[PDB]
Every structure is written in structure tokens, then in C-alpha cells.
Amino acid sequence: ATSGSCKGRCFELQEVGPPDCRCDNLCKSYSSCCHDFDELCLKTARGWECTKDRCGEVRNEENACHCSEDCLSRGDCCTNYQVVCKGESHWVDDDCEEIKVPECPAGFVRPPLIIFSVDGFRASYMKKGSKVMPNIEKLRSCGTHAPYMRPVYPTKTFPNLYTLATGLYPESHGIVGNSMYDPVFDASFHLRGREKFNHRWWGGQPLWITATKQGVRAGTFFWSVSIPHERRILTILQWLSLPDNERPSVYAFYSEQPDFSGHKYGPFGPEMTNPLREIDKTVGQLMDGLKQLRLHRCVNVIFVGDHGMEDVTCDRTEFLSNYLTNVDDITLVPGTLGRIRAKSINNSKYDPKTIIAALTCKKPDQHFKPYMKQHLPKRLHYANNRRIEDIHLLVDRRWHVARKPLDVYKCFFQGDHGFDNKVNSMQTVFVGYGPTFKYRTKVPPFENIELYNVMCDLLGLKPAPNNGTHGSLNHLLRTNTFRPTMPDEVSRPNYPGIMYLQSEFDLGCTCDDKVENKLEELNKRLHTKGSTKERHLLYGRPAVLYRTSYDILYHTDFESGYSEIFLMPLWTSYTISKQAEVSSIPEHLTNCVRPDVRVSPGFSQNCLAYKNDKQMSYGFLFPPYLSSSPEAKYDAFLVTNMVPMYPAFKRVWAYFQRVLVKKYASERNGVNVISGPIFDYNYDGLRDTEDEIKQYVEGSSIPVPTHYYSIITSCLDFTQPADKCDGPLSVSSFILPHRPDNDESCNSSEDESKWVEELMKMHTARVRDIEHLTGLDFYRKTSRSYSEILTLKTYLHTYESEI
Numbered sequence: 001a002t003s004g005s006c007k008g009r010c011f012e013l014q015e016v017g018p019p020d021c022r023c024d025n026l027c028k029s030y031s032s033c034c035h036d037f038d039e040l041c042l043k044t045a046r047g048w049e050c051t052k053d054r055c056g057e058v059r060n061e062e063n064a065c066h067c068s069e070d071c072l073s074r075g076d077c078c079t080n081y082q083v084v085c086k087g088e089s090h091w092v093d094d095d096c097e098e099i100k101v102p103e104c105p106a107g108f109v110r111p112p113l114i115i116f117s118v119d120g121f122r123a124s125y126m127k128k129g130s131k132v133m134p135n136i137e138k139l140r141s142c143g144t145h146a147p148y149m150r151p152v153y154p155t156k157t158f159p160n161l162y163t164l165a166t167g168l169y170p171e172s173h174g175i176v177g178n179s180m181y182d183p184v185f186d187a188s189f190h191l192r193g194r195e196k197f198n199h200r201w202w203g204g205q206p207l208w209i210t211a212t213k214q215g216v217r218a219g220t221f222f223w224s225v226s227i228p229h230e231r232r233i234l235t236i237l238q239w240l241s242l243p244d245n246e247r248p249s250v251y252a253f254y255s256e257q258p259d260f261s262g263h264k265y266g267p268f269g270p271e272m273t274n275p276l277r278e279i280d281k282t283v284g285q286l287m288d289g290l291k292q293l294r295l296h297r298c299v300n301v302i303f304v305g306d307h308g309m310e311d312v313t314c315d316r317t318e319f320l321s322n323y324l325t326n327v328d329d330i331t332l333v334p335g336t337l338g339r340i341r342a343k344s345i346n347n348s349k350y351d352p353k354t355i356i357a358a359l360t361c362k363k364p365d366q367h368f369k370p371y372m373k374q375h376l377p378k379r380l381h382y383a384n385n386r387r388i389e390d391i392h393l394l395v396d397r398r399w400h401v402a403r404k405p406l407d408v409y410k411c412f413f414q415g416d417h418g419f420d421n422k423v424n425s426m427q428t429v430f431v432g433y434g435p436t437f438k439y440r441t442k443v444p445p446f447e448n449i450e451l452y453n454v455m456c457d458l459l460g461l462k463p464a465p466n467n468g469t470h471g472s473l474n475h476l477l478r479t480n481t482f483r484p485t486m487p488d489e490v491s492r493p494n495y496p497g498i499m500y501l502q503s504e505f506d507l508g509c510t511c512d513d514k515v516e517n518k519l520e521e522l523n524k525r526l527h528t529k530g531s532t533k534e535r536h537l538l539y540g541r542p543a544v545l546y547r548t549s550y551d552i553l554y555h556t557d558f559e560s561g562y563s564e565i566f567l568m569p570l571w572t573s574y575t576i577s578k579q580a581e582v583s584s585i586p587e588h589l590t591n592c593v594r595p596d597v598r599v600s601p602g603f604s605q606n607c608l609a610y611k612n613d614k615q616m617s618y619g620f621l622f623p624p625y626l627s628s629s630p631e632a633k634y635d636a637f638l639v640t641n642m643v644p645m646y647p648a649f650k651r652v653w654a655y656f657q658r659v660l661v662k663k664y665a666s667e668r669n670g671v672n673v674i675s676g677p678i679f680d681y682n683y684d685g686l687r688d689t690e691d692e693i694k695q696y697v698e699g700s701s702i703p704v705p706t707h708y709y710s711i712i713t714s715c716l717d718f719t720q721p722a723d724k725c726d727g728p729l730s731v732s733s734f735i736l737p738h739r740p741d742n743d744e745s746c747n748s749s750e751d752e753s754k755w756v757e758e759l760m761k762m763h764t765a766r767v768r769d770i771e772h773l774t775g776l777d778f779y780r781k782t783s784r785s786y787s788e789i790l791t792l793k794t795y796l797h798t799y800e801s802e803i
């Protein structure tokens, strides 16, 4: 019954549900507005700007906004009122003055936060559109900015907007696409329709709920498309004029541009200048408005995008009907990513192995690649949700994927987004301006999952649990609310000595090692006691953050943390100087594996299991090829340095170890390497407990890793060697999937120099990702501040060309 009125209720802040009619900014979307809503709340008379004649006018309540003398008190002047009528200046015209402290009106308990979000605002617009965006350029250069901010995958609207609000990966918050099907709900989420309004889709805890639960009032974050931007600004300005006990502390403004035009004209279509002009004018209105309310040196403003925009056209579409004979037995979620599932959910005939095989490397210039979702690069964090189909297609930038030619022809678009989140055109923007942000400061690029913690900080809230790393963006803020602290080590290591005789071992292992002093025997003794450890463990031992039993093992060339539960190192650490030399495994040592006299037969692997497992071979965490001497090389063949490896994977690993490590050491002036196994059988991005392992080397208790990681650190100033670095560090990491084939790599039949490094780059990772997956904590002992270390751990080396 939409029988009531909006008289004196325009844009009320507490949503009253039907039968009674609504007057809030979402009533339109719910089709529940009072009949006078447009009349009372959506006035448009005389436009949005004051004119010289309108100055000092007599108040007419039918105007969109007012230029009467009483307007400042009422809180509803046109944003340009003071400029036109009182000889004031526009906010953009004033010089940039540092905001050393909040300058707020009496009654303001804390600086308000305004989140100005812009849809499809590609990172490079800041430079390429600078001439036409003066208000935005002022915010950017006077406040705190990043060259770009990295969105989450898929680089879609809803997943990214909701990630900004929650600090969660789409897989955790549930909005895994702009459209999705949930097999338990048996329902589809679409941009059009009512399904999207049901609360069951939306997980996690968004900023507005966090604020509310802790006594902080929020304006609405959603705006009906039919409410013009001018009216959105005026409403926020009106809300900011409310009494102390009624006024929100956090606000949000949303713009459908430049996304809307970008899809039609491409990211840099000549038609794109005008929407950039218009976003800027809107920002100018907001800032003029705040300057009227004397809040422009009081409010913190975030100008943030959800994702970028890429050139994409109808002709650049791959069709599945070109690869698959049985295209009618599948459903495809199409576009800039592909998700495939059975047409009929309960049929045993559907074999996803054969679907993938048919999609794998079939055309030489194929513009997508199929994955089982658990095999996608771990950095995408796109697997742990039932709404994510088992089959995924990663589509090349500039391209689309569709099921059949008919879906596409029965071409109106030149731009789209959704691709891999490391892709340059998908990068978006961040600017922070206000008393709490830093003054004229550029910060390095960061991921959007980190922003939720900052917004909570800006508002004095305790953030719900999320995927940000709290403290990693403290360097954006003039004054911090949160002091990060290293987590306490849970398990302390054992430091075992020589306790077992060779003959106590029945491993089925052999080696040609029976050939051999005062000088060289007391010296190798120091190596096993930790003498070269200051060289090979450069940032302290990683802390183990869960309950387990493990040994620190020292050697001349490397140090490891050996798990007696998993029968292999959790981590192996070693430094390769720029002058280090690669050698080969001597002919008589090719099948050499030696018992480790510090570790019991009971907590060791055996060579017999590997003999009997025809699928599984083994490799070594510290590489024999990088031994410092023939005597030291024997250490590399210890049974405690050994890890299970598919022969297909050994090709990757051997090339990394034999060739790439030395190359990185040359280019970066030495590198420190920490390598180890990862077990993530339920693809949740977190370390598996021992009873979750789904695969063992056949007939043994040796678990098989799902992935192998390395963290490769050196000095940021490369004129200093990795092992003698005084300043900031530089890191790149990866998490390689441990797969029994190389189907992922279409050129894998060629030499490793043509494909291995490309594969590794694809599977680049943050140290922080590896921490979740191992339960380890790295960089415990450096000369660097912990906040700078947190930033370092969230760094991702993307290998894209310069933005």
C-alpha cells in the first residue's frame, strides 16, 4: 500500500518495510516509493547551479536547490551558491594547503568519510584525462595516491564493489560474478531481476553493517539509476547538515560512468572525454558543497574505482561450438571469463575431463585457456565457493568467449572488463584526501582487498575478519589507529644432533659416497652446527604458527625446517651470490639418496615407495646444481632434502633450479631463496591439516604436495648483494601447481627455455599467499619496520609492462 506520503521524509535513513511506503533512495529499485516521491524528493526546477539573478531570491520550495539567503542554514543551497552570490572561490581554484589536523564544526565527533566510487575508471585515465579533470587531479596531487590499485578477479562490477566494502575475496563474500548460479539455492543471480535483492547471496560483513554494529551511522551505499548525480551530491550534503545524533559518519557516492560509455566506445574512444569531464564536475560540486559547510578540511574523501576497461569487440569471440561436438550438454557463463557446468545437474554421463581435453591447446592462437578451478593461479583466490563452476576459462585480454555464434549475433560494444586482475587495462584508481590521509604522497600500487581495514580505521571501527593485511596500508595515513604486531610462534623447533647409525636405516636408498683430517673435519662440523647460517638464513627462521613437530637442520649451503609429521621440509632456505657457479650432478651421484643421521628412520622418507609408485618420482628442495663444493653436494642428497615430484613437474623444477635461480642471482646481485611444499587439497587457500591430505606416495605416509613455492628475496638497492643489504628488500614469489602433466603449457613439448619461466610468471604470488598456505610467518628478523615488512609481504610481482 503506497498510500502514505514523503512529505518531510525525503531520503529518510531508516528503511521502513511494506505495507507502509518508502521514501529512501532505494524505494525506486523496490518499486515502493510514495506516490509523491518524484514530486517532493526529486525536484528539478531551475537546474543545479545558481545564477547572479537568483542571488538573495525568495525561497521557492519547488526548486531543485536554493540561492536564497536562508539556504546555508537549511542545508540545501546549490553547491555553487557561495561562489556566485558571496564572491567565494571554487574549491579547485584554491591552492593546496596541508591539512595537519581535522578542522571540523562543533558537534562533529570524528572526521566523516565519503567514498566516491567510479565504475570502470581505468588507472591510466589519471594521466591521459588530466587536462579535463581539474578537481580529480587536485585531489590526486594534494592528497595520497597510488599509480594504480589492483582489483580482484573476476574484474567485474559487483564482485569488486562488494570486495571494496568487505575486504574479502569474492570466493569468501559470495558474489563471484555479475551473474552466478547457486546449485543449493537452485537459483540464478542476475543484474536484472529480484533475485539479487535476497540477502542469502551476500556474505561477509560490509562497511555499512560494521559501522552500524559499532554505533557509527551510515548513509546508504546504493543509488537508483534514475536519481541524477546532482541530486545524489545534494542529498549527501543535506545528510551532513542533520543534527549530531542523526548525522551519518560514513557516506557513499556511486557513478555509472565512465563504465557505461566505456563499454559502448572502448576505453579511449573520443566519446570518452565528456564522461570524464562530467565525473569531474560532480567531484567539484561535492568539494564546493563541503567548502560551504566548512567541512572541506574535515572530511576524508576516497576516490576509488572498481576495475578498468579494455578494447573488446564482437569479432574477437571464441566459440565453444568450434571445439566441442556436444555444446548442448553444457551451460556457459560467457564473456571475459568462462565458467562451464552440466546443462542437467544430475547426470553421470557428464565428464569434465573430456570437456577440458577438448578445450586444451586445440588451435595455435587459441584465445582462452581452460582450468579445473583448483588449478587456477592461487593469486586469483577463485575456487572456494559452490557458485564457482569446476571448469573455468581464463580468456585473453581483448577477447570474449561464447557458446555458439547465435548467442552473440541474436555488434554494439567496443569495451569490456572481467579479465585476470594482473592485466594492465583492468587496473583502477585510488586517491585519499583529508585530515587523516597523508599530504602530497604517492604510495605503491596495492590490492583493493586492503581498503576495508583502512576505512574501518578512518571511522574508528574494529574490522570484521577479512583478507586484507592490517598495517600494510598504514603508510597511506597521517595518523594510524592500528599497530600491527608479529604473531607469536606456536611451535618451537628441535635442534637434533647426530643420533643414528647408518645401519639403523632400511630406506632402500643407496649412494656412491664411501670416499674420503683435522682442518676439514672440524670445519664441516661447524657447518652442521650453524656456522654459515647467517649467510643462508637472512631474515630469521620463519615462525611456525600452528602446533607441530619439526627439526632445524643445518648444512654448508642451506638450512631447513624439517617436519616429522609431513616427512619433508616445511621450508628450505639458501643464498646464491651473484658470483655463484652452477655445476652438474656428477654421473655416480645421479641416483644418490642418503639417510640423515640426525633424523630417525621412523620420521624419514624411503626410496622404496618411489620405486613402487610408478606415477611419482622425487626432487630436492635445495638444488644439487648449486652446491658450493663436491663435498657439500652430498648434503643436497640427504633423504631430508627430498620431496615427491611427478616427472612432468621435475622438468619445471629442474629448470627453475638449474637455470633460473642463477639467472636471478646475476640480475639481482645475489638472491636468497626459501622453497617448500604446499598442501591445499580443499582449495581454500589455507594450509591443510594432516588428516585432509588426499594423496600419498603409494603405500607410504609421504603426503604429496599440491603446490611448491619459492620466495626469492634480494636487496632493493641492487648495488648491494643480497647477503649484505642495508636497506629495503625486494621480493618475487611463486606457487607452482604440482601437476602430473604439463597440459597447462601449450609449448611444453619444446625446450624448457621456451615455456617454464612463462608458467612461473603466471603463477606469481604474494609472500602473504604463501603464509596462508603454509601457516608460516616470514621475515621475522630484519632491520626494517614491521609495517614496511607487511607491505613487502602483500607485494605481487605481476610481470606486466609499465602502466
Ligand SMILES: *[C@@H]1O[C@H](CO)[C@@H](O[C@@H]2O[C@H](CO)[C@@H](O[C@@H]3O[C@H](CO[C@H]4O[C@H](CO[C@H]5O[C@H](CO)[C@@H](O)[C@H](O)[C@@H]5O)[C@@H](O)[C@H](O[C@H]5O[C@H](CO)[C@@H](O)[C@H](O)[C@@H]5O[C@H]5O[C@H](CO)[C@@H](O)[C@H](O)[C@@H]5O)[C@@H]4O)[C@@H](O)[C@H](O[C@H]4O[C@H](CO)[C@@H](O)[C@H](O)[C@@H]4O[C@H]4O[C@H](CO)[C@@H](O)[C@H](O)[C@@H]4O)[C@@H]3O)[C@H](O)[C@H]2NC(C)=O)[C@H](O)[C@H]1NC(C)=O
Binding pocket: 168, 169, 171, 172, 173, 174, 200, 201, 202, 203, 204, 381, 384, 385, 386, 465, 466, 467, 684, 685, 686, 772
Ligand atoms: C579471507 O577471509 C575470510 C574471513 O576471515 C576467511 O574465511 C573464514 O575462514 C574460516 C575457515 O574456513 C571460516 O571458519 C568457519 O566458520 C564456520 C561458520 O561460518 C559461518 O558463520 C560465519 C561467521 O559469521 C558471523 O559473524 C559474526 C562474528 O562475530 C557474528 O556476530 C555473526 O552472528 C555471524 O554468525 C560466516 O562468515 C560464514 O559465512 C560463510 O557461509 C555463508 C553461507 O552459509 C556465506 O554467505 C558466506 O559468504 C561464507 O561463505 C564462505 O565461507 C564458507 C565457510 O564458512 C565457504 O564454505 C564458502 O565457500 C565461502 O567461502 C558462515 O555463515 C564454522 O562452523 C567453522 O568451524 C568448523 O571448523 C572448525 C575448525 O577447527 C571446527 O572447530 C568446527 O567444529 C567446525 O567443523 C564442523 O563443521 C564441519 C563442516 O560442516 C564438519 O566437517 C565438522 O565435523 C564439524 O562439525 C569454521 O570456524 C570462516 O567462516 C570464514 N569466514 C568467511 C567470511 O568466509 C578466509 O579463509 C580468508 N581467505 C584466505 C585465503 O586467507
Ligand SMILES: CS(=O)(=O)c1cc(Cl)cc(COC(=O)N2CC[C@@H]3CN(C(=O)c4ccc5[nH]nnc5c4)C[C@@H]3CC2)c1
Binding pocket: 115, 117, 119, 157, 161, 162, 164, 165, 178, 191, 207, 221, 222, 223, 224, 252, 253, 254, 259
Ligand atoms: C565501493 S562501496 O562504497 O563500498 C560500494 C559497495 C557496493 Cl556493494 C555498492 C556500491 C554502489 O553500488 C550501487 O549503487 N549499485 C547500483 C547499480 C547496480 C546496477 N549495475 C549494472 O547494471 C552494471 C554496471 C556496470 C557493468 N559492467 N558490466 N556489467 C555491468 C552492470 C551496477 C550495480 C552497482 C551497484 C558501492
Ligand SMILES: [Ca+2]
Binding pocket: 679, 680, 681, 682, 683, 684, 685, 686, 687, 688
Ligand atoms: Ca586447505
Ligand SMILES: [Cl-]
Binding pocket: 648, 651, 741, 742, 748
Ligand atoms: Cl611434460
Ligand SMILES: [Cl-]
Binding pocket: 548, 565, 688, 689, 690
Ligand atoms: Cl597438521
Ligand SMILES: [Cl-]
Binding pocket: 124, 424, 425, 803
Ligand atoms: Cl595502461
Ligand code: NA
Binding pocket: 610, 611, 612, 613, 614, 615, 616, 617
Ligand atoms: Na616412481
Ligand SMILES: [Zn+2]
Binding pocket: 120, 157, 259, 260, 263, 417
Ligand atoms: Zn562495466
